[PDB]
From Swiss-Prot:
Full protein name: Sugar fermentation stimulation protein homolog
Gene3D superfamilies assigned: 2.40.50.580, 3.40.1350.60
UniProt xrefs under NCBIfam families: sfsA (TIGR00230)
Gene this chain is encoded by: sfsA
Pfam assignment, any one: SfsA_N
UniProt superkingdom: Archaea
Length: 231
DNA sequence: CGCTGTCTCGCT
DNA sequence: CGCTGTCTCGCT
DNA sequence: CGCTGTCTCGCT
C-alpha cells in the first residue's frame, strides 16, 4: 500500500449513458455534462445508468470532463487507461516493482512489426519491451482480461511472442485497477485466442506480471502490490 | 459503443 | 461511420 | 527552424 500520486480535483457523478465509445453523459451538481472515456472495452459491468462515477475537469476539446473510474467496494475502480499508464510510470520511476528495481522509460509507443507496443524500458542488464493491459473485469478475487474480443490485443501478444522466441526480452503487465483483488487470470469467454496466446507467450519466456491498484475518494491512487498471476 | 430497423432464441 | 485526443507521414 | 497546404499513422 504505497501512495503513487493524486488526482485533483475529483468529482462524484451519476452515470447516465454512453453517447459513443469515447463519450459518456454524467450528472455533476444538477448539470448534465459530457465526459471523455479512454478505454475501448465494453465495461458493461460499470456503464449502467445510475452508478456513481468519478470525473475530473479539463480545458478545451469536445468534452469538459474525463470519466476516470467508478465506485467499487467503498473505493474506486480506475477505468481510464491513460491514468493507469501514469500510475504504471510512477511505479517504474519509484522502483516499487521487484522485476524492475532500477530501470527507465526510453520510448513510448515504440514500433514493432506493423504494430506499436506500449513501452521500451532500459534496465541495467539490457533492453526490455513492456506492454500493459487493463484488467478491470472482476470475478470474485480475480481481476481479468479481456471483456470482449480484441483483435488488436491478439497481434500485440504475437509481437511479444515473435520478440521473445527471437532472443528479445518481452513483458506484459496487467493493470488490476480494482480494489479487493489479489489474483489475475484471463477471461476465456472474452477472447478465446488471447487465453491460448497467453500460454504460448508465457512458454516462450515472455514475462507476465499483474499489479493491484485502486483510487480513494480523496483522489489518491494506491498501489497494493503484485497480483498472483494464473495464466 | 451506439448507431436504425427488423428479425431471431429458450424457458417461464 | 463517427465518435476523443493526441499522435505520425512525404512532398511542396 | 518555421515556413504553406494537404495528406498520412496507431492507439484510446
Amino acid at each position: 500500500a504505497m501512495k503513487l500520486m493524486e488526482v485533483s480535483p475529483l468529482f462524484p457523478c451519476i452515470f447516465l449513458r454512453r453517447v459513443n465509445r469515447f463519450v459518456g453523459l454524467v450528472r455533476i451538481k444538477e448539470r448534465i455534462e459530457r465526459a471523455l472515456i479512454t478505454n475501448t472495452g465494453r465495461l458493461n459491468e460499470f456503464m449502467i445508468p445510475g452508478r456513481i462515477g468519478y470525473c475530473t475537469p479539463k480545458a478545451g476539446g469536445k468534452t469538459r470532463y474525463i470519466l476516470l473510474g467508478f465506485e467499487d467496494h467503498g473505493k474506486i475502480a480506475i477505468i481510464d487507461t491513460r491514468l493507469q499508464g501514469k500510475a504504471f510510470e510512477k511505479i517504474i520511476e519509484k522502483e516499487l516493482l521487484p522485476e524492475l528495481e532500477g530501470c527507465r522509460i526510453i520510448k513510448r509507443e515504440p514500433r514493432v512489426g506493423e504494430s506499436r507496443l506500449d513501452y521500451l524500458i532500459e534496465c541495467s542488464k539490457g533492453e526490455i519491451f513492456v506492454e500493459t493491459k487493463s484488467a478491470v473485469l472482476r470475478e470474485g478475487e480475480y481481476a481479468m482480461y479481456p471483456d470482449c474480443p480484441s483483435v488488436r490485443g491478439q497481434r500485440h501478444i504475437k509481437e511479444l511472442i515473435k520478440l521473445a522466441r527471437d532472443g528479445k526480452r518481452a513483458m506484459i503487465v496487467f493493470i488490476g485497477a480494482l480494489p479487493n483483488v489479489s489474483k489475475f487470470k484471463p477471461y476465456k469467454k472474452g477472447d478465446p485466442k488471447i487465453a491460448e496466446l497467453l500460454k504460448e507467450a508465457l512458454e516462450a519466456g515472455v514475462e507476465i506480471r499483474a499489479l493491484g491498484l485502486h483510487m480513494e475518494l480523496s483522489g489518491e491512487i494506491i498501489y497494493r502490490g503484485e497480483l498472483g498471476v494464473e495464466i
